[PDB]
Design a protein around this ligand. Structure first.
Ligand SMILES: Cc1cc2nc3c(=O)[nH]c(=O)nc-3n(C[C@H](O)[C@H](O)[C@H](O)COP(=O)(O)OP(=O)(O)OC[C@H]3O[C@@H](n4cnc5c(N)ncnc54)[C@H](O)[C@@H]3O)c2cc1C
Ligand SMILES: Cc1cc2nc3c(=O)[nH]c(=O)nc-3n(C[C@H](O)[C@H](O)[C@H](O)COP(=O)(O)OP(=O)(O)OC[C@H]3O[C@@H](n4cnc5c(N)ncnc54)[C@H](O)[C@@H]3O)c2cc1C
Ligand code: NFU
Ligand code: NFU
Ligand code: SF4
Ligand code: SF4
Ligand code: SF4
Ligand code: SF4
Ligand code: SF4
Ligand code: SF4
Ligand code: SF4
Ligand code: SF4
Ligand SMILES: [Cl-]
Ligand SMILES: [Fe+3]
Ligand SMILES: [Fe+3]
Ligand code: NA
Ligand code: NA
Lengths: 240, 392, 282, 240, 392, 282
């Protein structure tokens, strides 16, 4: 299988999370072919020589099987826009890797005006422009979550991936999802697992109920993903 | 007489472009290294937001060095509000910074291993790197709450105390890391000293030479009193690149007394360990030796730490809306600076970041000149550039 | 409708420690499991639901036998035990964590193990997941109304509460025992429990409760290999007193009845919610 | 036209906003038949008398033309649940009057535990249970916006009401709507009208862009309703 | 020997029920007035939220008196944090409270006009009410930013200064309000003194009598020093109703020294203006006379106001996480109490509200006893009950 | 498509006040209309875009003639003038409010008047809505790069900027005049301006710009009865010097060309956004 890591307007933390499979990363990279990742490999190098210029380009190759797309798309940046469509064109399976790619995440708060590109102000999850096959929320998703996704992708575990294939249709996320979809709907039983899930510790259990510190929420979707009162596929009931 | 453009460069973090004017023999005459990453604009969107959000947001500059920005953020806000973090919080904050750098330097050696590490040694080399990073990330996880973006780094100190059990575990793992570091150092230093790539190409002796000075306030943490921030001025890409190239650059141009400055391990080893070597290889060597300095300091911190000492200050986040708080931290890649103005309500009035690789980008542009363009990326990687970091 | 989920064996059991029996709710299985694991290096931390002088619950990462004993006994109000599961493996540094909770919290734990997006380096550090049976739970102020206004006893003066024989029981620290019919407690129960389809904590390693077993004993479902290895270690060590659930009264049939009654009653609520448009887990 | 004011879990401020048509409330009340409103009329009184009880009940009457339904529904209160279905059954047009009814508003933050009904913890906008024909956001919507809606309903101004008929399908609102739908999508031109619309002053224009102080946002919908880069129906172009 | 249940009661805010035990002649023997409104639970969800959100949030207790709750909220958080609002911010805050009451009393008179105002006088009566409410709402709009839920009422004072022009407009409108009030008072007082409805029904002379005392801390604003909050204890509905009614009650039962107390205009007129009359008609009467007290005080504030003086304290919102701040305000319907504990970060640790009608509900329960059940609702309305207020 | 929207008459016009002509951008129509209304009680407050030493903009509720004169002249950066429209009618107590804005801000004003959800007691207080023509705006640091890096002038030294004859113009305090081709400014323009379909502020009471009229003069569209009354009053009072747009060069044809150019170019972007799934106003 040919996989690639496309780095849009991300922080590379999602790739680091994949690297934090530690020694097992060799088992991951040996179970696939990493055909593209600017951080890791010199691909796909093409040299264009004219009379006045030698252009050495590292391009996104064709025939990618799984694209791990990280980061949001800057609407004011033409290369950002070109890369997200190129990733979709060249990859059979597009994975919105991490909150930035899945739902915008921290880049939801971008409003431009900073040197040296002050018109860069509009960042969207990749799914606002391209079809996403699988979305992994969190900032970043855990190494374990990534391992399981890649394993399921390679092994054809459609059932395991259904929750992420469903997330792929969701481009917005907020701590208010717990409110809007669980607490407000007489579904919250106060397990508190959402609070444990939050990377920013924005969720506080008070009197058995989640309190979201909204100015601390970076819109990663991890709480919403964990809450068993939203999604609870039967596959979770299997124990050994 | 030809223009060589390499884009994107590879095996560093982020999205850059090398634009080179070379002579007929391929020697770089005028070099330009520049970030073309979009500007997410953290400094601007942080205006109007509460101070406690700053370490959380700026962590997302970069997933390799998130600790460095959270640390600089809280140090800036603490300076703005004259908040003193307690002794053991400050010990745990520095430990968490050191844990991050303990993963970053091996990670970088992993990224350059295609050029320096023979193929037959690659798997054993990467296994050792990942073992070292596993320990460094454990320290950030344990003390910061998460390895990638640590919510425990807060204005006032560190949010959570560790237990004597955790402390003892980190000490044991640091001892093991030190063994791996000795193994890694003894293997890599001879390679860097040979000035030869793994395909046998010999590197020019003057590779990556430049005339610029260094900035480093501390060997393992940071010290705002060791820099006169009034002498730091940020210029525009038009001040360092040709017009056609300047308009593509996403970063500012940091200067000290109007001069470009290098930051990072060599700058630190120059200021504190009497390391005088110039060139790109000396950068890799300083970075390699710095792994030992970090793990020694981490254990030293653990011996000093009182796991029962308070880690958060009780002082409120109250600024006067005027003081430009200074927060400096020696990131893996160099002197890292955040600044903040905070009002009486703890809200961010003004925010600024001058990141390590923001300093090194214009240095790299000059450093790649004088040698063949085939060596330019090897000079780039010696600086371990982090471009999302530099752009923010 | 399946009554108990998957399990290897169902027993009646009891702690052999007299001290555990003085402090525990039923057989003392949770405390015995926690204390055995802590004392034998099988666990280095256990999540417990602690209470203050007013019976307000607080979830906590216990690391000592004394802390497990202080958390023994049921608190019939919501305690978010899973909310501390990350702290437990971060700053507490637990690598062999014991988890306890009602079926819903065990469901939450299995999910974060399957889809650990926000749980980096958490799943592998869960050594024993212990479920307690649960029919319904209560906001603190609902249980406060039940105890103070229907049973006439101050929260301060409550030594133990219990549910059995169709009634809710308050044991005062001053010797009194007050009971009320369970129908009086229903107006105060957390209404999100009305979609709960899990009575015997069907996804735990070990699931333990009061129904089906006599007073002072517990009905214990051994479900997973982890639970089986743990439970057997306790038995071979003499930590537990065990009787076959057949030889005990009222027996497994009462557990089956109550479990199926919960599933039947709450499936109707789930269908009612679907009918009017309200969201339900899927 | 027979109109009624149904008060669910609201504060009556929306009705007070209607009252703040001042002397023109008589013109409004003379142009319709106020058939039901517990605050204003003793309707619809029905007396049932047994040997041991006299039951004097004020019921919602049948054959309501326009129901101005204010407040959210408490899922744990049977009378609240009964009233929202009653209003729907008995009214031809149902108007979600104010954010509480339209999107939940302040009640989105309810999480229960307060005496003397601690199990009251789940509040939803009425559109989560019943079909809504028109939704007026804000907390409260202005008297002018209410006049215009009632005038348009009475005059068959379907065109004017389209934006509110479209809102009736939207049951969630948040200051993040400006981010997710305008700023993130390269549509925000910095007019600042959203900031001027906010009842809580949660929105602050910084460097020509809206900054949403999320902990001050009560999810009222006023800002998203205002933004001309979201909805700009042609009728706004009609000037003297 | 019969039970009379009236449900819902009408011509008041919110959702209540009368449950009455009457004798064979219809005379109420045991009265129960109780809120059945769902508990939105502001006190519970405010825990964990920042202080500045409290005046915004508790405003939504009620759209008729939102100013009262914002005022009490900010006065409580100010008390908890030892914040002192500046002179002119305090004057504007009291003015905003008064303008709200200047709209509320006429509104209640409008709500009761079906029972007391002749059919032929209704339109003219309503036009005068709305003219007065328009002026009252203008003051709250101008000073509080919105008439219904005033975002300017904030911890530290009042967010915005008004201009001399705006000040001169409100003074002119108050003078006009005073003219309307004299007209309204001269029309309504004879009706209330006639103890006769507009259908000729004579009201009993002892209608709405009770034995309870009053709580009022101020005639127009509030004074937390005029009450010992330690003697205020909130009991449950089971302490005042039969079990089958108590489970329906949504409010708590406030007592002072173990006893029920009446709050409102009559309480204020008894404490400050030597008004001694018992019964329900004396409530309508005190409310009517307070309209003059209010507009007189608004003009007196405007005469004192310095439109250029500071309105917001510069003190930060910093508490110790322990002090139970007390904020009291004489709402239109009476003594209104908010309490808060605030931590060092400005966040709400604990929050409580004892609202005016919360006091009055158990009083109304006793007040309706002794007279025919056909008069119970008139006794209810005399207390101008606000039930969303009482429940929150 | 239609070029100008609805209007009663288009003229070329200029303020008679010499003081205004020294400070204004073109004919001084906005300052003349504001100062006339303030001095004659037709307006009691006017919204202005002010600037600081570095040309950073702040929206403001001006109440004096001096404040109107200090705000005269174009700032080619975003100033959210509508953001103060409620403050103006609240703490400022304006009942005859003048509003100025680019077409998009004028559009936002007509929208809040039609659907005043968050604009209690605002619409009936808007006395005059003045629109200025606009091709595109820019973030401040975008215009700072244009002026400081492409024109080589410090923002502190800028006395006036202008657009015309295909060029962006900087007038230095010290006498220099630097121009650049407008194509050099395009990379710095606010990209949300690329869906804008309004060039001449088609929904204002009075719309005024520079295109079509000679230097020192403005092209003024009188659109609404409120604008027609206000404008005629100014003309009868001698506050404006007016010439027919047919008698002036380059005339209405340039305005038509530039308006349809914006509409055609931005309609393509609107369709391109719809094509790739991005939201577009409707
Ligand atoms: C709300 C609720 C409803 C229940 N309903 C039933 C029922 O219908 N039938 C039945 O057979 N059993 C039920 N139980 C379980 C029963 O009450 C006993 O807790 C169970 O048998 C375990 O007792 P033990 O002696 O074995 O362990 P113990 O040694 O007594 O310790 C019990 C453990 O449970 C934990 N705990 C206590 N309160 C809570 C809480 N609120 N949330 C999570 N964990 C907690 C404590 O940390 C403690 O370690 C319920 C428990 C709860 C909390
Ligand atoms: C971004 C921008 C682009 C423009 N593009 C064109 C164009 O393509 N063609 C054309 O003919 N005219 C354009 N104009 C209008 C032109 O620049 C003059 O502002 C207009 O002709 C009015 O000049 P005046 O002499 O009549 O009024 P003046 O007396 O000079 O006063 C001008 C008024 O405009 C207001 N103002 C200034 N800057 C801003 C701003 N950034 N946002 C909102 N209001 C502001 C001030 O409050 C002032 O009261 C543009 C204006 C702007 C701000
Ligand atoms: N090390 C490092 Fe960063 Ni990703 C850089 N450059 C930060 O300060
Ligand atoms: N007046 C009044 Fe309220 Ni609507 C009551 N009761 C508040 O404090
Ligand atoms: S999701 Fe988080 S960790 Fe991943 S790229 Fe975005 S900011 Fe970085
Ligand atoms: S995870 Fe548990 S506590 Fe959090 S919202 Fe979901 S049900 Fe409630
Ligand atoms: S509350 Fe926490 S977990 Fe949930 S979206 Fe926000 S940051 Fe992510
Ligand atoms: S009944 Fe279900 S949801 Fe309620 S507490 Fe028990 S396990 Fe949790
Ligand atoms: S939307 Fe606002 S004003 Fe309307 S009922 Fe709800 S809280 Fe009250
Ligand atoms: S109203 Fe819309 S376009 Fe204007 S500033 Fe607000 S979000 Fe931007
Ligand atoms: S930001 Fe303001 S206008 Fe928008 S939903 Fe929140 S409170 Fe309402
Ligand atoms: S071009 Fe349109 S959107 Fe941009 S500033 Fe001008 S009027 Fe506004
Ligand atoms: Cl290379
Ligand atoms: Fe920077
Ligand atoms: Fe209360
Ligand atoms: Na585009
Ligand atoms: Na009750």
């Amino acid at each position: 299988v040919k996989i690639a890591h496309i780095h849009l307007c991300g922080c590379t933390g999602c790739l680091i999370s994949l690297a934090d499979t530690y020694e097992q990363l060799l088992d991951i990279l040996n179970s696939v072919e990493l055909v593209y990742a600017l951080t890791l490999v010199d691909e796909k190098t093409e040299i264009r020589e004219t009379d006045d210029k030698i252009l050495i380009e590292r391009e996104i190759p064709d025939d990618i099987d799984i694209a791990l797309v990280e980061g949001s798309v800057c609407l004011e940046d033409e290369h950002s826009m070109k890369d997200v469509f190129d990733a979709r064109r060249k990859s059979k399976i597009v994975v919105a890797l991490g909150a930035c790619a899945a739902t915008g995440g921290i880049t939801r708060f971008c409003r431009g005006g900073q040197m040296s590109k002050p018109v860069h102000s509009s960042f969207v999850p990749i799914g606002d422009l391209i079809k996403v096959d699988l979305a992994l929320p969190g900032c970043p998703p855990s190494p374990e979550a990534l391992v399981n996704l890649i394993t399921a992708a390679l092994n054809g575990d459609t059932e395991y991936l259904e929750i992420y294939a469903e997330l792929a249709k969701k481009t917005e996320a907020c701590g208010c999802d717990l409110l809007v979809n669980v607490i407000n709907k007489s579904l919250c039983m106060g397990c508190g697992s959402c609070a444990a899930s939050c990377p920013t510790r924005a969720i506080e259990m008070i009197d058995g109920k989640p309190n979201v510190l909204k100015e601390l929420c970076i819109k990663c979707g991890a709480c919403s993903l964990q809450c068993p009162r939203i999604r609870f596929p039967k596959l979770i009931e299997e124990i050994e | 007489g030809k223009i060589v453009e390499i884009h994107p460069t590879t095996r560093h973090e982020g999205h850059t472009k090398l634009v080179l004017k070379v002579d007929d023999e391929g020697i770089v005459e005028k070099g330009a290294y520049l970030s073309v990453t979009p500007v997410r604009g953290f400094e601007k969107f942080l205006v109007g937001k509460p101070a406690e959000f700053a370490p959380i947001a700026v962590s997302r500059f970069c997933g390799i060095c998130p600790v460095a920005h959270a640390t600089s953020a809280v140090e800036a806000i603490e300076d703005a509000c004259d908040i003193t973090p307690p002794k053991d919080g400050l010990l745990l904050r520095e430990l968490c910074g050191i844990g991050n750098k303990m993963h970053s330097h091996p990670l970088h050696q992993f990224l350059i291993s295609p050029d320096y590490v023979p193929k037959d040694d690659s798997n054993e080399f990467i296994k050792r790197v990942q073992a070292m990073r596993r320990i460094g990330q454990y320290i950030v996880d344990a003390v910061g709450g998460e390895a990638i973006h640590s919510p425990n780094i807060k204005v006032g100190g560190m949010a959570k105390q560790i237990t004597e059990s955790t402390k003892a575990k980190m000490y044991y793992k640091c001892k093991e890391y030190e063994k791996l570091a000795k193994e890694q150092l003894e293997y890599l230093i001879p390679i860097f000293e040979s000035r030869t790539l793994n395909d046998g190409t010999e590197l020019p002796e003057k590779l990556g030479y430049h005339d610029f000075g260094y900035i480093a306030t501390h060997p393992t943490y940071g010290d705002r009193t060791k820099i006169d921030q009034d002498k730091v001025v940020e210029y525009t890409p038009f001040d360092v690149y040709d017009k056609d190239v300047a308009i593509q650059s996403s970063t500012t141009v940091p200067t000290y007394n109007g001069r470009l400055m290098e930051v990072g391990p060599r700058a630190r080893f120059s200021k504190f360990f009497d390391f005088k070597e110039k060139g790109a290889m000396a950068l890799h060597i300083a970075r390699a030796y710095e792994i030992s300095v970090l793990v020694k300091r981490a254990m030293e911190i653990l011996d000093e730490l009182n796991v029962n000492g308070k880690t958060m200050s009780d002082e409120p986040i109250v600024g006067d809306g005027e003081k430009l708080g200074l927060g400096v931290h020696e990131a893996a890649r160099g002197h890292n600076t955040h600044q903040a103005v905070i009002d009486k309500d703890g809200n961010i009035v003004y925010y600024n970041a001058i990141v390590a690789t923001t300093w090194n980008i214009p240095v790299i542009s000059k450093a790649v000149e004088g040698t063949h363009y085939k060596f330019a990326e090897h000079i780039v990687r010696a600086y371990d550039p982090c471009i999302s970091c530099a752009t923010h | 409708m399946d009554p108990f989920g998957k399990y290897k064996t169902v027993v009646s059991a009891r702690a052999a420690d007299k001290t555990i029996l003085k402090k525990c709710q039923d057989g003392g299985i949770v405390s015995a499991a926690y204390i055995y694991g802590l004392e034998n290096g099988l666990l280095d931390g256990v999540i417990v639901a602690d209470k203050d002088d007013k019976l307000q619950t607080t979830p906590k990462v216990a690391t000592t036998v004394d802390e497990v004993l202080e958390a023994a006994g049921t608190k019939y109000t919501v305690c978010p035990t899973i909310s501390v599961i990350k702290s437990a493996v971060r700053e507490y540094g637990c690598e062999k964590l014991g988890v306890v909770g009602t079926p819903c919290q065990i469901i939450a734990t299995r999910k974060l193990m399957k889809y650990p997006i926000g749980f980096r380096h958490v799943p592998d550090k869960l050594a024993l997941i212990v479920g307690i049976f649960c029919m319904e739970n209560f906001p603190y102020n609902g249980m406060k109304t039940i105890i103070e206004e229907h049973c006439g006893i101050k929260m301060e003066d409550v030594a133990k509460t219990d549910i059995g024989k169709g009634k809710f029981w308050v044991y005062s620290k001053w010797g009194d025992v007050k009971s009320i019919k369970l129908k009086e407690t229903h107006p105060y129960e957390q209404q999100s429990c009305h979609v709960c389809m899990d009575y015997t904590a069907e996804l735990a390693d070990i699931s333990t409760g009061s129904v089906g077993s006599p007073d002072g004993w517990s009905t214990v479902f051994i479900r997973t290999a982890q639970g089986e290895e743990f439970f057997n270690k306790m038995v071979e060590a003499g930590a537990l007193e065990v009787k076959p659930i057949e030889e005990v009264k009222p027996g497994l049939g009462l557990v089956e009845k109550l479990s199926l009654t919960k599933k039947e009653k709450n499936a109707k609520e789930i269908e009612h919610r679907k009918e009017i448009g309200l969201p339900v887990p899927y």
